[PDB]
Amino acid sequence: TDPVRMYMREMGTVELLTREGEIDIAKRIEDGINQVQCSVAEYPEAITYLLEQYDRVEAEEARLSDLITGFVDPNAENSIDPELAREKFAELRAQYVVTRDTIKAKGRSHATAQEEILKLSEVFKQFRLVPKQFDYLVNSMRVMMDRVRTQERLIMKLCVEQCKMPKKNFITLFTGNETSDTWFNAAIAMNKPWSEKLHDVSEEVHRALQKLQQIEEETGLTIEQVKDINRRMSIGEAKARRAKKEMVEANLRLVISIAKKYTNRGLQFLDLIQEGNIGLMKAVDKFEYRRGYKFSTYATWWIRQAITRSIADQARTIRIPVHMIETINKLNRISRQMLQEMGREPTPEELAERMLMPEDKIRKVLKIAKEPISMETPIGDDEDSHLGDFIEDTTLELPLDSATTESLRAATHDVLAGLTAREAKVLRMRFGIDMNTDYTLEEVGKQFDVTRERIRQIEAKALRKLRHPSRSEVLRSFLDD
Amino acid sequence: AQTKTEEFDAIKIALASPDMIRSWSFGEVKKPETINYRTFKPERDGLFCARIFGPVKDYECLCGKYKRLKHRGVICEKCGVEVTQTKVRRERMGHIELASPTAHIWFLKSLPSRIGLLLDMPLRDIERVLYFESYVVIEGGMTNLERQQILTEEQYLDALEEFGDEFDAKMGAEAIQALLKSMDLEQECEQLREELNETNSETKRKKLTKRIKLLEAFVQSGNKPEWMILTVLPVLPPDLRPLVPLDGGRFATSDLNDLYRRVINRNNRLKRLLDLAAPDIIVRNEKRMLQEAVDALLDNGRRGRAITGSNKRPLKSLADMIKGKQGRFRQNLLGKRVDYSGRSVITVGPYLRLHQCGLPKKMALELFKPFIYGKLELRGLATTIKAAKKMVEREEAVVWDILDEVIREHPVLLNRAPTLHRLGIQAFEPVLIEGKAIQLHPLVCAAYNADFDGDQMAVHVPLTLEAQLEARALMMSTNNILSPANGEPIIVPSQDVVLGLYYMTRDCVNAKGEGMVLTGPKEAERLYRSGLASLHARVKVRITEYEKDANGELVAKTSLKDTTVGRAILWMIVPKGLPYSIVNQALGKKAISKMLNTCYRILGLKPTVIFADQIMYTGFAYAARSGASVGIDDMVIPEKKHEIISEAEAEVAEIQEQFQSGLVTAGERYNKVIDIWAAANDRVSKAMMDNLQTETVINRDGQEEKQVSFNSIYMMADSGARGSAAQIRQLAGMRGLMAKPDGSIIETPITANFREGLNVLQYFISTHGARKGLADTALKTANSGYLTRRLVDVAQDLVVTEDDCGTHEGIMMTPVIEGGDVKEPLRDRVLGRVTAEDVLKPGTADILVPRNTLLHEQWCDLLEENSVDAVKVRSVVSCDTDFGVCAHCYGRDLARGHIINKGEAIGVIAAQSIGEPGTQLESSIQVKNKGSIKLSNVKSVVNSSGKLVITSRNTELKLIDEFGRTKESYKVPYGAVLAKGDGEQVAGGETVANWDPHTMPVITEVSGFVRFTDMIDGQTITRQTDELTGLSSLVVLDSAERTAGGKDLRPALKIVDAQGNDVLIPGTDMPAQYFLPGKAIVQLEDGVQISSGDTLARIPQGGLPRVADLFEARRPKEPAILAEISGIVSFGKETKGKRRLVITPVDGSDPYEEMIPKWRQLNVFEGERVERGDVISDGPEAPHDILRLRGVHAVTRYIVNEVQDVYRLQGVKINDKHIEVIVRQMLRKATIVNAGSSDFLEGEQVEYSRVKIANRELEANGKVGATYSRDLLGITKASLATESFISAASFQETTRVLTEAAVAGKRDELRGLKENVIVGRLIPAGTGYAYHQDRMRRRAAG
């Protein structure tokens, strides 16, 4: 086989790092996550979102799980108690208004304001979020970044390309000011051939800046402050993810050692390693360097968890649940015991006693535990034949029976023709003959001019004439079926 | 225009687009789920689904809310299942969206790589990128890497830092898809045509032409190279890969289902890994197996080998469904189960007619089951279908009466395994007989290879009026009394019928009642059955014979004839329109077969059928009356059996004395002793035919003894009923000689016959030939059956197109004469054939014999009196008839009595006519007419012994008669002894020239002693035994088997005088040294004096495999050398013992040279005017060499004659017209010389070029005349070049054909016969030929 050989040669180049070498990578992981957490704390909308989504679940009475478990999780500087949940989100709301009056006065972050913003970040770092709720907070900065650089690209499109302008003059004007319109109209005041020809598209350049300058009022930070955090956030995300790769790459040899034992079960050899590598992903994300224990012991449990879960979920054609798999494994262990202790073979009456389960349960599982047989199983060969060749189709109706159904409808049509006019219409509605819908006794009465009780009389009258041997000799032949 | 009509005419195959796959699909398979363990139902979005593929039940939903056939085409809002029939699960397909592009295995691994040839990159470079080992350059500019450059990770890192941005290179199957994305098909073809201008090449030119042929076919169809790598994977319908509960309870699933799961599993994992942290090592490895997952799904037997989850077997992949000896493509013909069919053991039916068979009562009731119900409700006996079902099952008396009414006038086909020729399936009108066995007519049993001992026959029943008519008009036994292989009738009496007529016609010396006058043939029956006269004895009878009139019929000649009593009774059986002389003689199998053959052409088809049955009825009756019995006393041993044996028994011991003494050597004893027993075996056999052949002696009338013996064994041998003369030899006389496991014949033969008790040693000796002969028979059917299969696949797609083809050209036909004996006359050869040119031979006064007319059996009689020779008749080879045979320019139908009607498939009959009877599989010139021998170019020299050996390369023999004219022409080769010189009178029956047939002797010129210079024993020469002169002789070995010691030594004989000096060759002052080539056998010893004319050294040169070898056009081990260009030809330079032939004419240019091996003996010396196609090396001729030089006529007659020679020795009669049909299928496909429209080499049909040349020279804007040379392809070399992918993938390799059809974008218009059998359409032959012409005509207009 080809795919098995070169995989061992790809990870063979990467050497194993042990002891203090593991900590060097582990330190970059936690510092990488913390740098991202600092970027979320600096963002003003994240403080608003944490107060907005808190009132979404708290207003719907006191709960315990689902959404509240994703939030809270506090650390002072499991079922979460309502006493502390109301307590921790209380000072955050108080810090939202006190660190706002200093921003409106003078500059954005002026001396005293800078002291309170750093105080505001300390309150935000107190909370820890579950990945489910943590992802959208990052998306509140990822999608909004695709609104700042995209609109600036539109400004650059209708000035540098449309008006044919050098890129040197754009550096000083679109960095020092950014906010005001002292770069758009100020360039025309110098009087230049490529500066005066900007009036042709003036209704699109600084007008589109209202989808950029409005962000300063939407979020609470200037263009200088928005780009400073978003670009810094991408650093921490690249810090952790790339360091987690090095931890996985070095411990790929540990995955193979565990995967070789579970080969005779069902799944292919390479499928066990690839699923085991996904188990190694969980063994790094939840791992800490503050644990003070061996990485190999913690990784083995997570790698084995991924293999054991997939080995029962997949492998077989018909899927067998986790609880049902455990009973099949229990059957095989006692079958080895009872065969040689007694003498011959364990009977369903005797096998049910040691399992502490009723006879109707064991005899049911034995049928489910059997793997479906292959289609091309050779039986005797000689003239070359398979199992799938001798299997008959029961879905198809016989051509003799198909002709009988056609003959029955043709016979009944001549039978209904012999009836006295209205007698045929009733039976064709009561039994749905030659009609799409089947009608009830109440439905005919209102659509046949006659009363309700009379319908029962003429129905039996029509039947009696067809119960006669002289008239219905052809219909009596269909009674054989 | 029609949109919803499913009536198709053509099928096309191309590469599928990812968007086109979604068009087939109805939903996406995202889960590897199948069926729940609790309730056996499809799950969500797995392999088995109701929302995607269709509901499991007929017109029902999964939950069971929507019920009854009321709802149709209703999409559910609770489940999402369309309320339709469950047959939708057989037609609807799904799709799997791949996260990463995975390559197709059919376009990658299948040689010589479709992706590889399109990109000009070897497979080793593609796989290393795809497999994730190295990068590849896609875009190029000023990066020094240009294109398709393989780069490692360490090389790619340094290359990006130096350049980057503008440079583009990717890794994996994504790179290959991007490489096929960037390539421009319009500009790649222009560049390749420019470079093929100055540097052309010869052998390396083929790969350059291969690329153009691949690129040009890719653009014209519009396949797009981007779809080579799969992005969307289609899924099979759940019904084709089903999970059905068996009788026991355990499920049964397809191997495809197990393969599909291991595709989606890693597809779902890759979708997870791409968003949940992506390290390159793991991601590339997940893409590595996903590519292998599709590879194992499509064709498992390529890259690795996947093992089933529970079973230890290779899984049936998507490719394995089509191929594998028994799949889906191959089961359309062979593995086809058929309704309305029966099977039972065959039995005799003497009371039945030729058109009647004895079909069982209980079988016919079961077979015509629906036919009973149809004519039971119609009669008014049964009320409905169910009431008619109860009457049949109860076996009512009235049902048997109706059953006979339906069977009457309804034909029934009878098939026997195996069918070698078409007569294996014949229609018969059944007669109801009680029993479980089927009765067959004894006469038609000769057509099949059937014997009533334990054989079984298939009983097929036609259903429609069209099927009933083509069984009576075509497949009926009465219509098929003649064989399609030859003009001789196949329905010929055998065994009991022959023995009955033989005893009836034979005469005795003096039986009861002799010398009577007898009034009519009626009084002959009056005497025999009453008990007054026997069947034998010569008695005069009054007979009234009716001869054929010129107009017909008035001739009634009555005369007294001298016959027997039994011959007169048989005349009543003989029809009126037949002479009395045909029944006058004692009738055997050879004589009775002539009766039906004469009765056919003289009267018709109807009279001879009634007569054929009348012979059978009378044949059995008089065979029973005779009472022939094989007794132990009938096994008569020759009077002096052991007397002859004793004369030869110790005669072996006489040579045993010579074995020890030294008169006759040990090697010469074995072949001399065996000749005594061979002569003794024939002597006992000839003595046996005296006490068994004519042993009567006791005659009451007179004192004579001359009479044909009335022995029961001789009666079976002389008539030819059962048992030939060879069988009687072993039983009464002597068994003969037996063979050894090696192949040699045993010293002492079995003396004991089957009359006496054989010995224990003798019986163990005889067993070897029994277990070897039958062992050959066990594989004879397999070898000849493959030969029948071989000839069909090449000629099946050939039918009669036109009524007459406008060419007055054919093949010269001469009666085959071997040495001085005629095998087959002109009458049997030119019978059926239609003449191309009128008869111009003078003999009797007449006004010409008309051409383009059918030669009748009576018309050929006129040519016999005039003695006509060499007639050019219109044949199958010389035909310019688009695609098929031209009817009139072909010949007669052998099964019919006239010309073959248009529409009938010739190639299928031609293949079966040779494959069926395939199971049964000169040296000295003698003159009879008086004259005188005159010789030209004589260079004869008289030797010491007294042999007139000629020292000339070319010698011809001529005879001068009384008047002074040439009579016969014969060729004399080198190394031959002439009896008479120039101008000598010869007697009637005398040999004039004699030479050894299987050798090439070397003759010396100078006389004297022989020196063995450079002839060291062991180093160059070895000792063995020559098998012609013979004794112990020196054998010269070629430069391959020689030892390492003697490397540079030339084997040559030096001629010296009495002193020791060399005798000079008359002409040059060079010493006499005759250089001997390899393989040559030296007879002379050292010191032996030789005269002028003495031989120095001689140079040496099956059955069914021979026929197979000639049809496959395989070149022999020693091919014959032939001159290519006519003119003044001279030799050039020398090496050791070989000559380089330089052929130069007179006109311009003409640069040609040849190289010839050293051991070959030539037929030219120096400065010879040689013509095109002359024999230089004697022996077998190469099939390709004859076509190259002699033309497309001498090669066609070469195939006919060489194949027939094999069948003539075995005793098989096959016409020459059947062979030439396959010859036309060998000559097709020709190489072009002159520039026309496309390339030079290529592969275009002969007629395809003939349509081209007729269109180019007049119109079509081309004006160029494309010159073509005919090529020969032996069956399998021609059957591959079919213009259909449906026909090809039937017998050829399936994966290669389907890939070639997809890339080129081929269309199958369904014209071949094999093409329409697979799809389930009417055959473009016979009845369906007139149907097929209605659709082909409306393609141009519309």
Ligand SMILES: Nc1nc2c(ncn2[C@@H]2O[C@H](COP(=O)(O)OP(=O)(O)O)[C@@H](OP(=O)(O)OP(=O)(O)O)[C@H]2O)c(=O)[nH]1
């Ligand atoms: N024993 C015997 N009989 C033969 C043979 N050939 C023809 N017949 C009989 O001749 C009758 C008519 O045959 P056709 O072939 O129709 O002759 P036709 O065209 O000249 O009328 C049939 O009688 P039928 O079946 O009763 O048909 P019909 O007379 O009811 O039409 C058939 O039995 C033969 O070789 N042997």
Ligand SMILES: [Sr+2]
């Ligand atoms: Sr009314």
Ligand SMILES: [Sr+2]
């Ligand atoms: Sr036979």
Ligand SMILES: [Sr+2]
């Ligand atoms: Sr047999």
Ligand SMILES: [Zn+2]
């Ligand atoms: Zn439903």
Ligand SMILES: [Zn+2]
């Ligand atoms: Zn022709």
